[PDB]
Amino acid sequence: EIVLTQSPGTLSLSPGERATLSCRASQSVSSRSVAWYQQKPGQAPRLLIYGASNRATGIPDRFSGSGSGTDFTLTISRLEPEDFVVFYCQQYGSSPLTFGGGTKVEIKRTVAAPSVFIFPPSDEQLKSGTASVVCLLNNFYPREAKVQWKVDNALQSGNSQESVTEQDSKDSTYSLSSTLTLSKADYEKHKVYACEVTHQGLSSPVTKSFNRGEC
Amino acid sequence: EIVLTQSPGTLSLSPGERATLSCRASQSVSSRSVAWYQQKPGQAPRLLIYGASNRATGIPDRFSGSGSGTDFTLTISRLEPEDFVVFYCQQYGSSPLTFGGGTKVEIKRTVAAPSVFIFPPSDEQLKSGTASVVCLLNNFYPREAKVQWKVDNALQSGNSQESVTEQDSKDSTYSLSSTLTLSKADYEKHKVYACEVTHQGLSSPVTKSFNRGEC
Amino acid sequence: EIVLTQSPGTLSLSPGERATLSCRASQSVSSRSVAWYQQKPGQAPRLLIYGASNRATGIPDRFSGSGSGTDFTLTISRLEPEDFVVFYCQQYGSSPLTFGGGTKVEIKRTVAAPSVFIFPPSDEQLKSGTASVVCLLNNFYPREAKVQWKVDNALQSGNSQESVTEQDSKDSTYSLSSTLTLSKADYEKHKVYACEVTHQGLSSPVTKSFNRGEC
Amino acid sequence: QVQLQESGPGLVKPSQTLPLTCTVSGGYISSGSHQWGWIRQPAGKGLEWIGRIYTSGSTNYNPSLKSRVTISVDTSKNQFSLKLSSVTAADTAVYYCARVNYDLLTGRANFFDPWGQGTPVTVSSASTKGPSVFPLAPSSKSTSGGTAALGCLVKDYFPEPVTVSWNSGALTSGVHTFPAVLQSSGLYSLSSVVTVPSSSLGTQTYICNVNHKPSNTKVDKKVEPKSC
Amino acid sequence: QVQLQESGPGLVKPSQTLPLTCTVSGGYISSGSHQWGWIRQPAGKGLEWIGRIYTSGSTNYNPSLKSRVTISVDTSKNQFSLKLSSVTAADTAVYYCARVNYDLLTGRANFFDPWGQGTPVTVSSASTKGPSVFPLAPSSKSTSGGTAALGCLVKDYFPEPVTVSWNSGALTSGVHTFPAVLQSSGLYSLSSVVTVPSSSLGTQTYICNVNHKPSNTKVDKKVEPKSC
Amino acid sequence: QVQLQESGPGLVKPSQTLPLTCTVSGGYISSGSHQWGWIRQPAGKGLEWIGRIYTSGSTNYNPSLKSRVTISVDTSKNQFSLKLSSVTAADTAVYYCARVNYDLLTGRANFFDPWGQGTPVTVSSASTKGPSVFPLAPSSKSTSGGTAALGCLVKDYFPEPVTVSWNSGALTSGVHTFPAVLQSSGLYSLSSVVTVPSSSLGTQTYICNVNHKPSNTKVDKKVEPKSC
């Protein structure tokens, strides 16, 4: 089977410029048999190009593709607010059918730094024997960031979950959060907790922490 | 074998204007079988056009070629700073494969005149039994120029070497130099030397000379 | 044989407009086998289009042709000062080869009226037994005009010649002249002569005449 | 124009079969030069082919799924179905039914236009359970530059979705709803946080409206700064 | 590039033959996929085909000229020739030799690129004769709005051309040279008229320089207003 | 993507053989529709083909080099090699290994994309030798309009290259490095001249830094106006 690789993993641009996507095939694709799809997050995919050069009916003329052999390209003359979505490349020159990996397109923006907030666990949850600690990152960019949980200055691994919202429609910034789950016995035993953030916009890591029981 | 000829030998133009290159074949080339290569000085060549009309992947759209029979053309819509370089044409319609001669493209500029400088041979070299006399031309244009060495008003032939630097990146002017090599006996015997320059910018030839031993 | 007709006989426009020429065939022409030629007055013709859609090497991109069946068109995107010359259409879909009639293109200009001058015959010509009378039209437009010779108020037919210069390069106006040739006996017998001009710019015909022997 | 609509359970315990049906309108399965197939898309991953079928009854399956996949066609009702056996938690995904193009000479499957609406499927043995709302009360630790943050925590609910709104939709600015995350126990959990000015903490007592259709549970919890 | 050059007498009396030769440079007649033919263009008319020839020696002629036309090829000297017999005054024209394209399958003649320079031919029995310059003196009849005209009349000359200049080329503005017109007697004649201001009539005595290469005759005549 | 890298001695005395090896990465020689060949480019001239090879072991060579060239393929290591015999000073060039396209029907070599990086080769019997730096001291003959010129002369060095810098790279403006020129004796030589203001001659004593990797020779010589 032909293995299709799509790069870059993410493509960042301002509105209005030109976007070009690459789908490279592990071996020759017969008769220029490649097609491209565009999926809005939370919606069924869509057909844009078939045969690597033909445009589907009703597709805006700003979408065009070309190529042959083991390299095919999709180019957009001018981006639109609704063109920042995932894109997939398909090959059907040799069975079985295979898809690409997906190339997300995001709105580029000036670098911004996160605002680190911390929240102690609530009493009602503690009554149930479970404790949750969450450290929040708000309006940051780029998306990439790394966070770790320290208990009594001891690194925590294998017990932290991460969640990031989709790019906002107003300021085009994400919002990350790491949740720490520890049973009641573990929470009471330890006394100090802290969340650390490492991000491009921040020259040095910024630490926010709370002390258990501190009114 | 089909002999390919490329003209003009050199093409001079300002940035942004249109450049057209010609590769004429001594015999019919079957199935429009010609490709064009682009080599940066001191780098491996590059493929631009194959079949005389098809553009290779990742090549800027400003490059286009066409033709049929025995007349083929490469045209650039708008020049760029990095397009003032050598170009080659190949034919592969009938074996064996053959290349062109090369068509250098240079940045055109207002005519400038050379500044002729002279340098007597150095004493340290003189101990070794060898004497070198060099007359230097700086910041002139066009490239073509002719220089001769006269010893006691006697023309020197077969013992002069010429070297020219590549077109500069700031003022786009060349710098020629002729080196005269004569053994110890020949240098001592003669007393007067001179290097003469003829160039378009100079209304009349300009002579600079030195007298041996003149402090 | 297929008979080719080209209309209009003459085509007038200002520089810069779009010019379209029609070549209609009396019979179906196989495989879109029509070609176009452009001849500068007093020069060998030139090949522009072959096959009714393909452009010859080195022809400006403003020349394009199209059509099929029994109707073919040559269209110029933007006229140029040197594009006001004759154009020929050829068909080679069925032997024997045939050409068109020719469609002259002229520079359109504001209507202007002719200036009618008259010239009595010279004595030197009279000594040889021949008399010539010429009425001159200068700097007029459009080209078409009609002139007749009257002797003693008697219309002259079968003995008048007309010559017109080519469109001028400065004011783009023609200059017509009619020459009347009559032997010595005929000239002496008659006493009154006149040349009449009918032209668009003139509301009514303008007559200039001379009386024989009137100093 | 041709339209397709999926239909299925949406929640299958492990080791059963997954029956899905796609109903075609605006076109006839028998009279046409198209095949009909299924695609899926696991959460946070790319599209994966499953198989196809023709009006004649001939089918083609993904080699990695040929042993479990089974597709059938019912031209009388203008439908085609899918039967995936031995389902596992790794089979959770959104399933699509499309209209497969093909080449007349060889009959192989070309591109996949048009597509269906899609239908999520979850494969887990967990039983339905309501949420446990907890308040993320604001504090000086969460206040920076005169701006404070607060949220309402949802934990131990299953299955999706959970709709969270603030002040019955009156407050919409600054509202962030974190996507749910699977836990080791097999239960989902998410946190909703909204940023509000610090000066307004002592003026408005915000409310997190939590509703859970699968369990028909509606709970409202008030968020206020901790007395400590 | 390929180039073509014609060669011929240029003046043939009626009822003889018309030999013309075209010499090819920059290309070889034998080694190529082209034929070679002739075209003409009678004065004030359109192009007319004559015939072609191939390296193998096969020829095709215009049906209306098949009886008189004869074309031959000399590959050794890289030339091809034309022989038109029973020439008549209607055969006056400008003859071109071109490179005929053709289709491989059938061998018929396609379009005609490139062309030669051309060579005029005149078919008449008239003998060489010099011109008879006469002055078209200005008069009040030829003066309008302060502007006067005058010219120098040439009559009974043969063959073409005749070069007429004013003041040895010093005066060029307003100079009109009428194309020659054939007369019933078989002799050509043309008139050159130049417009000059009326006030300058009594200041400059213009000169019409008439020169005739065929007869090696050079004549100058001065034009002044008639004393009458 | 596919990449190519050459490998060879770089200095061969006359009459030996020239072994070069090209290693392919990002693609497999056996599984593909491309051939692999060699090209060269002698100093100051155009590209010249040498030969090709296929995975099957079939080769094609330039007719003018068919007697001396020998090309072999080693699919196990993903490599192909070149062997040029009876090398001569005319064989000096930069050797490239490319990926040759071909047409399926006939198997002939089409265009040459992509290319390798290249590897210079010098064919001479001269032995390694260090440079002889000499100062081109400025003088009133070399001063024009208040601007003076000076340089540092390098002679009798082999092989290339020689790096010349002024003031350890501090001075870069106005620095000209003349390309080396081969001499009759077989030794290279070049001169570097930098233009500096005349008034600055009595303020700064410039330095020409010469380094010569092949002989591991590093020499520094100071340039000052001649006392004469």
Side-chain angles (χ1 to χ4, degrees), chain A, chain B, chain C, chain D residues 1-221 223-228, chain E residues 1-221 223-228, chain F residues 1-221 223-228:
Chain A
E1 69 276 16
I2 306 182
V3 175
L4 291 167
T5 198
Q6 282 192 243
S7 281
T10 307
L11 188 153
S12 296
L13 294 174
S14 295
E17 183 178 2
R18 294 179 66 188
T20 292
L21 289 82
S22 173
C23 180
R24 165 181 53 267
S26 178
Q27 65 182 357
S28 192
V29 168
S30 296
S31 300
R32 313 218 296 150
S33 289
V34 165
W36 288 88
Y37 303 92
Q38 168 213 6
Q39 189 198 34
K40 278 73 69 177
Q43 303 204 357
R46 184 177 178 179
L47 176 69
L48 301 181
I49 302 292
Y50 62 70
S53 311
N54 290 318
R55 185 177 65 247
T57 45
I59 291 295
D61 291 331
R62 66 185 184 273
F63 291 107
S64 296
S66 303
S68 66
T70 61
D71 297 313
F72 303 78
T73 79
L74 177 68
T75 301
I76 316 161
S77 56
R78 186 179 295 276
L79 282 72
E80 294 293 328
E82 61 87 19
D83 299 3
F84 300 69
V85 288
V86 184
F87 279 76
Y88 290 97
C89 67
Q90 181 181 2
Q91 68 89 31
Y92 55 86
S94 87
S95 45
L97 295 189
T98 61
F99 285 92
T103 284
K104 180 67 174 66
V105 188
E106 65 183 1
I107 297 169
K108 182 174 73 175
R109 183 177 182 271
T110 186
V111 173
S115 301
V116 175
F117 292 164
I118 302 299
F119 277 73
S122 183
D123 62 358
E124 290 181 340
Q125 194 203 2
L126 294 174
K127 298 295 289 183
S128 66
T130 61
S132 61
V133 176
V134 298
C135 64
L136 187 153
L137 287 65
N138 182 327
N139 296 115
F140 74 79
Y141 183 77
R143 188 269 299 164
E144 190 277 331
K146 188 268 183 181
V147 161
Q148 68 275 18
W149 269 124
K150 296 183 290 294
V151 175
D152 294 332
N153 191 359
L155 183 66
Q156 297 301 286
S157 185
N159 63 6
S160 291
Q161 309 267 15
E162 183 178 1
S163 296
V164 65
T165 75
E166 183 178 1
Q167 184 177 182
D168 186 74
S169 64
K170 300 289 94 175
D171 62 358
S172 47
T173 65
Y174 315 92
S175 300
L176 182 139
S177 68
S178 193
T179 297
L180 185 75
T181 301
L182 302 166
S183 79
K184 180 67 174 66
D186 316 323
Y187 176 46
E188 61 86 20
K189 187 269 183 182
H190 303 284
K191 181 68 173 66
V192 183
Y193 306 115
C195 183
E196 187 71 79
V197 298
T198 310
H199 171 70
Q200 177 185 349
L202 302 168
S203 58
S204 178
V206 175
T207 311
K208 299 294 188 291
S209 58
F210 66 92
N211 223 327
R212 182 163 66 74
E214 267 190 4
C215 295
Chain B
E1 68 276 16
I2 300 150
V3 175
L4 291 167
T5 198
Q6 282 192 243
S7 281
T10 307
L11 187 153
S12 296
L13 260 189
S14 295
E17 183 178 2
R18 183 180 63 83
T20 188
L21 289 82
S22 66
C23 180
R24 214 179 305 90
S26 178
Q27 321 193 15
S28 192
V29 168
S30 296
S31 300
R32 313 218 296 150
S33 289
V34 165
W36 288 88
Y37 303 92
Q38 187 274 330
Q39 189 198 34
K40 278 74 70 177
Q43 285 219 321
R46 178 190 193 184
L47 176 70
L48 300 181
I49 302 292
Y50 62 70
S53 178
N54 296 115
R55 183 180 63 83
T57 187
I59 291 295
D61 268 344
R62 59 178 186 273
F63 291 107
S64 296
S66 66
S68 179
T70 61
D71 297 313
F72 292 162
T73 79
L74 177 69
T75 61
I76 322 171
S77 56
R78 186 179 295 276
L79 278 165
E80 294 293 328
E82 70 185 20
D83 299 3
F84 300 70
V85 287
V86 184
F87 294 83
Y88 289 97
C89 67
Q90 181 181 2
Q91 68 90 31
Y92 55 86
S94 87
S95 45
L97 286 63
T98 61
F99 285 92
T103 300
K104 180 67 174 66
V105 189
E106 58 168 33
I107 305 170
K108 182 174 73 175
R109 183 177 182 271
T110 61
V111 173
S115 66
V116 175
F117 294 99
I118 301 299
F119 283 100
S122 182
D123 62 358
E124 182 65 26
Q125 194 203 2
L126 183 63
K127 280 73 176 175
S128 66
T130 61
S132 292
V133 176
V134 65
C135 64
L136 163 69
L137 287 65
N138 296 115
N139 297 114
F140 71 73
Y141 183 78
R143 188 269 299 164
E144 69 275 16
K146 188 268 183 181
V147 298
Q148 68 275 18
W149 269 124
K150 296 183 290 294
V151 175
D152 294 332
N153 191 359
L155 183 66
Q156 297 301 286
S157 185
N159 210 6
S160 291
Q161 306 279 27
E162 293 179 353
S163 190
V164 298
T165 75
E166 182 65 26
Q167 184 178 2
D168 186 74
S169 64
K170 296 183 289 294
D171 62 358
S172 47
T173 65
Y174 315 92
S175 300
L176 182 139
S177 68
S178 193
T179 287
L180 185 75
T181 301
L182 302 166
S183 79
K184 180 67 174 66
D186 316 323
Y187 176 46
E188 182 65 26
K189 187 269 183 182
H190 303 284
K191 181 68 173 66
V192 183
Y193 306 115
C195 182
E196 182 65 26
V197 298
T198 187
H199 199 219
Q200 177 185 349
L202 302 168
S203 57
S204 178
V206 175
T207 311
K208 299 294 187 291
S209 58
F210 66 91
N211 223 327
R212 182 163 66 74
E214 267 190 4
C215 295
Chain C
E1 68 276 16
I2 306 182
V3 175
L4 290 167
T5 198
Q6 282 192 243
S7 281
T10 307
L11 188 153
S12 296
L13 315 166
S14 295
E17 318 186 24
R18 183 180 63 83
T20 187
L21 289 82
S22 173
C23 180
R24 165 181 53 267
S26 178
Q27 155 167 6
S28 192
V29 168
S30 178
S31 300
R32 313 218 296 150
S33 289
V34 165
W36 288 88
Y37 303 92
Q38 151 187 309
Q39 189 198 34
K40 278 73 69 177
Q43 297 189 45
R46 178 190 193 184
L47 176 70
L48 301 181
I49 302 291
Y50 62 70
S53 178
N54 294 29
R55 200 185 290 111
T57 45
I59 291 295
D61 271 344
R62 59 178 186 273
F63 291 107
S64 296
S66 303
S68 166
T70 61
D71 296 314
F72 303 78
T73 79
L74 177 69
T75 301
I76 299 90
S77 56
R78 186 179 295 276
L79 278 165
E80 280 271 38
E82 61 87 20
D83 299 3
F84 300 69
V85 288
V86 184
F87 279 75
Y88 290 97
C89 67
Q90 181 181 2
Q91 68 89 31
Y92 55 86
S94 87
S95 45
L97 286 63
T98 61
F99 285 92
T103 284
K104 180 67 174 66
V105 188
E106 58 168 33
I107 297 169
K108 182 173 73 175
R109 183 177 182 271
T110 61
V111 173
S115 301
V116 175
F117 298 176
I118 302 299
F119 277 73
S122 183
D123 62 358
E124 290 181 340
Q125 194 203 2
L126 280 152
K127 297 295 289 183
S128 66
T130 61
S132 292
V133 176
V134 65
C135 64
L136 163 70
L137 287 65
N138 209 331
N139 297 114
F140 74 79
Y141 183 78
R143 188 270 299 164
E144 69 275 16
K146 182 67 181 294
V147 298
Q148 68 275 18
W149 269 124
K150 296 183 290 294
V151 175
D152 294 332
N153 191 359
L155 183 66
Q156 297 301 286
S157 185
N159 63 6
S160 291
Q161 304 192 282
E162 172 199 296
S163 190
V164 175
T165 75
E166 183 178 1
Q167 184 177 182
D168 186 74
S169 64
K170 296 183 290 294
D171 62 358
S172 47
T173 65
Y174 315 92
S175 300
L176 182 139
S177 68
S178 193
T179 61
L180 185 75
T181 301
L182 302 166
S183 78
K184 180 67 174 66
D186 308 293
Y187 176 46
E188 182 65 26
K189 187 269 183 182
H190 303 284
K191 181 68 173 66
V192 183
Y193 306 115
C195 182
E196 187 71 79
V197 298
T198 310
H199 171 286
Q200 177 185 349
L202 302 168
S203 58
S204 178
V206 175
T207 311
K208 299 294 187 291
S209 58
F210 66 92
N211 223 327
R212 182 163 66 74
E214 267 190 4
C215 295
Chain D
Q1 287 69 240
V2 184
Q3 309 204 99
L4 301 93
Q5 187 65 61
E6 293 83 3
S7 296
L11 188 153
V12 183
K13 281 73 176 175
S15 82
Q16 309 159 261
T17 55
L18 182 63
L20 301 180
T21 299
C22 186
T23 301
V24 187
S25 67
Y28 293 99
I29 278 174
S30 44
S31 80
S33 66
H34 308 287
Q35 290 148 333
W36 312 83
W38 294 81
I39 311 98
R40 71 181 183 183
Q41 182 176 39
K45 291 174 71 175
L47 311 162
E48 183 178 1
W49 192 48
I50 284 178
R52 74 158 167 82
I53 182 149
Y54 198 58
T55 190
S56 66
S58 66
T59 53
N60 211 23
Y61 302 139
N62 210 7
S64 69
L65 294 174
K66 183 178 184 293
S67 62
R68 306 192 300 149
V69 164
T70 300
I71 298 170
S72 65
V73 73
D74 188 335
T75 300
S76 196
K77 296 184 289 294
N78 221 45
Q79 294 179 357
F80 55 103
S81 296
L82 176 83
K83 299 291 180 68
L84 201 78
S85 64
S86 175
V87 296
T88 301
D91 276 286
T92 288
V94 182
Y95 289 73
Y96 305 104
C97 61
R99 191 179 67 164
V100 186
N101 278 72
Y102 72 76
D103 187 26
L104 277 296
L105 213 47
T106 66
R108 310 251 75 73
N110 282 1
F111 48 88
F112 284 126
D113 171 79
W115 299 58
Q117 326 288 327
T119 187
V121 170
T122 58
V123 173
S124 191
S125 53
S127 293
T128 187
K129 185 183 286 185
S132 305
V133 290
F134 305 110
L136 305 169
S139 84
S140 67
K141 314 300 184 183
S142 58
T143 295
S144 191
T147 301
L150 60 85
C152 185
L153 171 56
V154 176
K155 176 182 208 293
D156 291 331
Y157 76 103
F158 177 97
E160 293 179 353
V162 160
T163 55
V164 190
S165 68
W166 291 95
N167 316 101
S168 306
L171 172 55
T172 55
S173 296
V175 175
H176 288 184
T177 310
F178 286 164
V181 176
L182 182 63
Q183 296 182 100
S184 60
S185 65
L187 294 174
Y188 293 163
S189 186
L190 61 83
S191 301
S192 191
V193 298
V194 55
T195 299
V196 303
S198 309
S199 51
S200 61
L201 294 177
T203 61
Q204 158 60 346
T205 300
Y206 316 96
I207 192 67
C208 58
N209 292 138
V210 176
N211 181 24
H212 190 238
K213 267 302 199 173
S215 74
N216 296 115
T217 309
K218 176 174 163 113
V219 184
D220 296 312
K221 182 62 66 68
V223 176
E224 71 281 5
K226 193 171 189 166
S227 310
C228 295
Chain E
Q1 288 70 240
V2 184
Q3 293 179 356
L4 301 93
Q5 187 65 61
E6 293 83 3
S7 296
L11 188 153
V12 183
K13 280 73 176 175
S15 82
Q16 315 165 207
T17 55
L18 182 63
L20 301 180
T21 299
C22 186
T23 301
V24 187
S25 67
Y28 269 102
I29 278 174
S30 44
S31 80
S33 66
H34 308 287
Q35 290 148 333
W36 312 82
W38 294 81
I39 311 98
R40 71 180 183 183
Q41 182 176 39
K45 291 174 70 175
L47 311 162
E48 183 178 1
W49 192 48
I50 284 178
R52 74 158 168 82
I53 182 149
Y54 198 58
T55 190
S56 66
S58 66
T59 53
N60 211 23
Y61 302 140
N62 210 7
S64 69
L65 294 174
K66 184 178 184 293
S67 62
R68 306 192 300 149
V69 165
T70 294
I71 298 170
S72 65
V73 73
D74 188 334
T75 313
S76 85
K77 296 184 289 294
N78 221 45
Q79 294 179 357
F80 55 103
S81 296
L82 176 83
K83 299 291 180 68
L84 201 78
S85 64
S86 175
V87 296
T88 301
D91 276 286
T92 288
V94 182
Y95 289 73
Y96 305 105
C97 61
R99 191 179 67 164
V100 186
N101 278 72
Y102 72 76
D103 48 316
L104 278 296
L105 213 47
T106 66
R108 310 251 75 73
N110 282 1
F111 49 87
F112 286 7
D113 170 71
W115 299 58
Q117 326 288 327
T119 187
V121 170
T122 58
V123 173
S124 191
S125 53
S127 293
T128 79
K129 185 183 286 185
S132 305
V133 290
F134 305 110
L136 305 169
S139 84
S140 67
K141 315 300 184 183
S142 58
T143 295
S144 191
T147 301
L150 60 85
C152 185
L153 171 56
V154 177
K155 176 182 208 293
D156 291 331
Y157 76 103
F158 177 97
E160 302 210 66
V162 160
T163 55
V164 189
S165 68
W166 291 95
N167 317 101
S168 306
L171 172 55
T172 55
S173 296
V175 175
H176 288 184
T177 310
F178 286 164
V181 65
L182 187 153
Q183 296 182 100
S184 60
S185 65
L187 277 296
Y188 293 165
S189 186
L190 72 165
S191 301
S192 191
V193 298
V194 55
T195 300
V196 303
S198 309
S199 51
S200 61
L201 294 177
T203 61
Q204 158 60 346
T205 300
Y206 316 96
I207 192 67
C208 61
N209 292 138
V210 176
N211 181 24
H212 190 239
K213 299 288 95 175
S215 74
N216 296 115
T217 309
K218 182 175 174 66
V219 184
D220 296 312
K221 182 64 69 177
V223 176
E224 71 281 5
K226 193 171 189 166
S227 310
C228 295
Chain F
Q1 288 70 240
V2 184
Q3 184 178 2
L4 301 93
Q5 187 65 61
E6 293 83 3
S7 296
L11 188 153
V12 183
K13 296 183 290 294
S15 82
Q16 309 159 261
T17 55
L18 182 63
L20 301 180
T21 299
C22 186
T23 301
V24 187
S25 296
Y28 285 135
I29 278 174
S30 44
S31 80
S33 66
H34 308 287
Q35 290 148 334
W36 313 83
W38 294 81
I39 311 98
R40 71 180 183 183
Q41 184 178 2
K45 293 187 286 185
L47 311 162
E48 167 193 17
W49 192 48
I50 284 178
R52 74 158 168 82
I53 182 149
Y54 198 58
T55 190
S56 66
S58 66
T59 53
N60 211 23
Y61 302 140
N62 210 7
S64 69
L65 294 174
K66 186 180 289 293
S67 62
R68 306 192 300 149
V69 306
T70 294
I71 298 170
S72 65
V73 73
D74 192 329
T75 313
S76 85
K77 296 184 289 294
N78 221 45
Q79 294 179 357
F80 55 103
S81 296
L82 176 83
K83 293 182 183 293
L84 201 78
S85 64
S86 175
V87 296
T88 301
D91 291 298
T92 288
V94 182
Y95 289 73
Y96 305 104
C97 61
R99 191 179 66 164
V100 186
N101 278 72
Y102 68 85
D103 48 316
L104 277 296
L105 213 47
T106 66
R108 310 251 75 73
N110 282 1
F111 49 88
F112 286 7
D113 170 71
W115 299 58
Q117 293 179 356
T119 187
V121 170
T122 58
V123 173
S124 190
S125 53
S127 293
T128 79
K129 182 67 181 294
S132 305
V133 290
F134 305 110
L136 305 169
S139 84
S140 67
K141 314 300 184 183
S142 58
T143 295
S144 191
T147 301
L150 60 85
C152 185
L153 171 56
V154 177
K155 184 178 184 293
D156 291 331
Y157 76 103
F158 182 76
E160 302 210 66
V162 160
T163 55
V164 190
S165 68
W166 291 96
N167 317 101
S168 306
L171 183 63
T172 55
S173 296
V175 175
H176 288 183
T177 310
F178 286 165
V181 176
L182 188 153
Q183 296 182 280
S184 60
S185 65
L187 277 296
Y188 297 135
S189 296
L190 72 165
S191 301
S192 191
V193 298
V194 55
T195 299
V196 303
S198 309
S199 51
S200 61
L201 294 177
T203 61
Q204 158 61 346
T205 300
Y206 316 96
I207 192 67
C208 61
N209 292 138
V210 65
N211 180 24
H212 184 229
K213 182 62 66 68
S215 175
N216 296 115
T217 309
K218 186 180 289 293
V219 184
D220 296 312
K221 182 67 181 294
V223 176
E224 71 281 5
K226 193 171 189 166
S227 310
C228 295

